[PDB]
Each structure stands twice: as structure tokens, then as C-alpha cells.
Amino acid sequence: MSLVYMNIMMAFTVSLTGLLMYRSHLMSSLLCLEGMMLSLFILATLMILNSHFTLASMMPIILLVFAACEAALGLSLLVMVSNTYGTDYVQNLNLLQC
């Protein structure tokens, strides 16, 4: 198929493996999650413009709106975590081992 689809899929896998490998922060995890959303947006848009399927032109906007509301919800969870522990470090979220 098209060559750009390989690159957008590989960008999704890069932000996947970044989201699937935490370093220290939770904000870096949310940035990798929204990079995954960005690659979904681009790849869906290239398919829909590529096929001239008219009605699905409203699909990437709905993807954007729902996952940005999801991003706001995750930022609110991050705010509550950082207010509890002082930092957004994921190693402070460890009380559920016992």
C-alpha cells in the first residue's frame, strides 16, 4: 500500500512503546497517549481523504473531541495525584500492592 501509512503506523508504535515504558512521570505517559491519538487522527484522515468517502470526514473530529475530553480527564487525575503526593511520579502510586 501507500508508503506514508507505514510511517504513521510506526509513529503509533513508537508512541505505544513510549506509553508502554514509563520513565518517571505521568505527564510523559499522557503525552505518549495523545501522540497515539494524533497518529490515529492523521491515519484516519489520510484513509478518508484517500477514498473520497464523504460522510466519514466528520469522524476524525469526533475522535479528536472524545479523546481530548479523555485527555482532560487524565489531566484531572494527574492533578489529583500531584496534589496528593507532591509530584506526578508514578512510583508514588504504589499503595495498591497491599
Binding site: L19, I62, T84
Partner: protein, 347 residues
Amino acid sequence: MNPIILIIILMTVMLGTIIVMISTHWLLIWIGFEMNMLAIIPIMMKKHNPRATEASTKYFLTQSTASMLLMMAIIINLMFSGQWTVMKLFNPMASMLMTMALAMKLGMAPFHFWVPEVTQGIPLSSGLILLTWQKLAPMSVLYQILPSINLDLILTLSILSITIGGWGGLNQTQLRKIMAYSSIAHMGWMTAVLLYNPTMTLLNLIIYIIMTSTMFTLFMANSTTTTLSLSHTWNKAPIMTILVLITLLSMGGLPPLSGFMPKWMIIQEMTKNDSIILPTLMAITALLNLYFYMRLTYSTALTMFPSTNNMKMKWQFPTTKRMTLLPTMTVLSTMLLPLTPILSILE
């Protein structure tokens, strides 16, 4: 929380699950999962303690990762099929991604690693919603995509779920972690029979929802979250120890109780398809589940652990808690095995 806002948020959870159930378009499936997650986050943060914020954060991360993999599977479906119908998937990579995403949304092993943490972190009512109502939408999608699910993948996920949910509860004393590992093992039972007969999947789902709803309602009616706090139930309300006894002996798959019905019908539909080793290992691994259930019954009903002196004040007060459908859910979770061919209503 405001009771009006609580009712509107619970209707939004139910509405997201219904939007996954009824819709024919993949974007509406993804919208239904987004609505479900977005509305169930405040139910987990009802009490506003740091364990609920931790549990809601871990739940958010896992369900968000699953929702992004789900939309990636939908996008590769639009690549290789040019359409959006919720049916079989037209690519094995999209099938693998969607099976992983739905296994993460269920919390099946090896993506099980959020379920006991999030279940312990949140209250018993929100844990009841998480372990019963949230299993409806991904099993609906798995019911809808079963002509394209890879068999080796779903059976690997199922046996890994059953074994890990068996060995998980053997080390536990907290009741919510026990119910969560029970959930992992029972979702393994449900998806092991999916590509053979999904009517038995729906049967196992309904019987498991009834039994888990019974156990969480008993835990809310006794306000017990540990094994050792559940132990004092014989000195407070002795009928509750009988009910947790019959319900835990049901959930282990012991005849003549109706928790034997799902796994027996699953073995009955897997031996038809010339699989003998796999339901044998499933049935033998269910003894671990039954072992920590028997641990709970020894601690609660079959023996009498020592109580304290302040129990004498609680002798003077009745249960004012709304034990909603607890006799109904108790009778359905134990005495339903003579009505076993009622499973044809799920065909």
C-alpha cells in the same frame, strides 16, 4: 456526591454500555467505551482518598491504552475493508489488536495487572460496577467479532486468565482482590468457549454477574472488606454467614449449585469440538479458585473466629442498609441448576 449527579452519571455509564451493545458502526462502539470510562471515573473517586485516585489513575491508563488500540484496529479495518460495520474484521492484525484491546478492557491475563489494584482501591459498590457491568460491553464486541478472532490467541488468553486468577487469590486476605482474581479466572472461562458456542459465554456471564453481585451485596450488607473483618459476621448476623457459604460454594463450581452450570456447559460444548485436554486443564485449575473460596468459608461460616466486646452494642441495631435484591440474587446464584435448560433463551 450529589444524588442527582450520581443518577445522571450512572445513566451515562449505562448509556455507554448500551451504545456499545446496540450500534452497528465502529466509531459508535469506540464512543460507547469512551462514554463508559469517562462516566465511571467519578464512581471510583466517590470517597476521595489517595487509594481511589491511584486506582482511578491506573484504570484510566489501562482503559485509555485499550481504547487507542481499539481505534487502531478500527482504522486498519477501514484500510483493509473500506467500511465500518460492526461484524467480523477483515485483517488478522486488526483482529489481534482488537482482541488485545478487549482483553485489556476486561482485564484478562496477562493484561490482568490492573484488576486487583483498582478493585482494592475503590469502594464495594464501584467495585461491583467494575466487575459486573463493565464486562458487558467488551463481551458484546467479542460476540460480534468472533468469525475473525484468532483461536490460538483467545485460548492462550483464556488459559492464562484461568491460571493467574487461580493462583492470585491463594495469597489474599482482602476481599476485593479475591473478587478481582475470581473475575480474571471467570473471564478466562467465558472467552475459552467463545469461538465454540457464545451462548455458553452469555450463560457464564449472566451466572457470574449474579454470583458476584450476590457477594458484593453481602460485603456491603456486612461492611466487611477483609477476611478477618468478614470473620465477625457470625456474631452479628448469622444468616449472612450461611449466604456467603452457599454463594462461595456456588462460585467454586460445586454441584448441585448453579455455579457448576456455566463451567459444566462449557466443558459440554468444548468436548463436542474434540478438545479434551483444554477443558480438563480448565476444570483442574478451577480447584485453586475453590481453594481460596474454601479458605473464606472456613474463616467465616464453618468456624467461629473470636469477636470483640464492642459487638454487643451492634447486637442492639438492625441492618438499615438497602439490601437490594439480595434474597433474589442469593436464590438465583445457588438453586438454579434444576432450571439449567433455560440457557436456550440466550440462543
